[PDB]
Amino acid sequence: YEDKINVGGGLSGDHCKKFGGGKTERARKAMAVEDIISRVRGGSSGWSGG
Amino acid sequence: EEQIEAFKSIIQEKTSNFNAAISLKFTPSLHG
Numbered sequence: 623y624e625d626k627i628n629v630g631g632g633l634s635g636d637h638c639k640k641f642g643g644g645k646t647e648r649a650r651k652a653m654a655v656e657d658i659i660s661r662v663r664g665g666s667s668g669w670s671g672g
Numbered sequence: 673e674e675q676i677e678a679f680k681s682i683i684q685e686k687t688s689n690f691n692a693a694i695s696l697k698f699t700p701s702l703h704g
Contacts (some may be wrong), residue, residue: 628698633689654675661693 623629664670700703 624697628696630694630696632691632693632700634689636687636689638685638687640683640685642681642683644679646677646679647675648675650673 623631662670666672677704
């Protein structure tokens, strides 16, 4: 504003903020159990085992 | 079997501004 005497004024304001977050988790598991048993009382010296 | 994974991501940003303007002119030979 200026009248009989001059007066000067000036102001400025600016602010900026940016936040960020990122997370990712991955997991994988697997289990398999296979057992085979064979008992033969056949009566041959070789063929029973064969 | 075992598997595990972990990801992380972080980003930051900041900005600031400031101005200042002031003028003076006085004239009641004299000038300013």
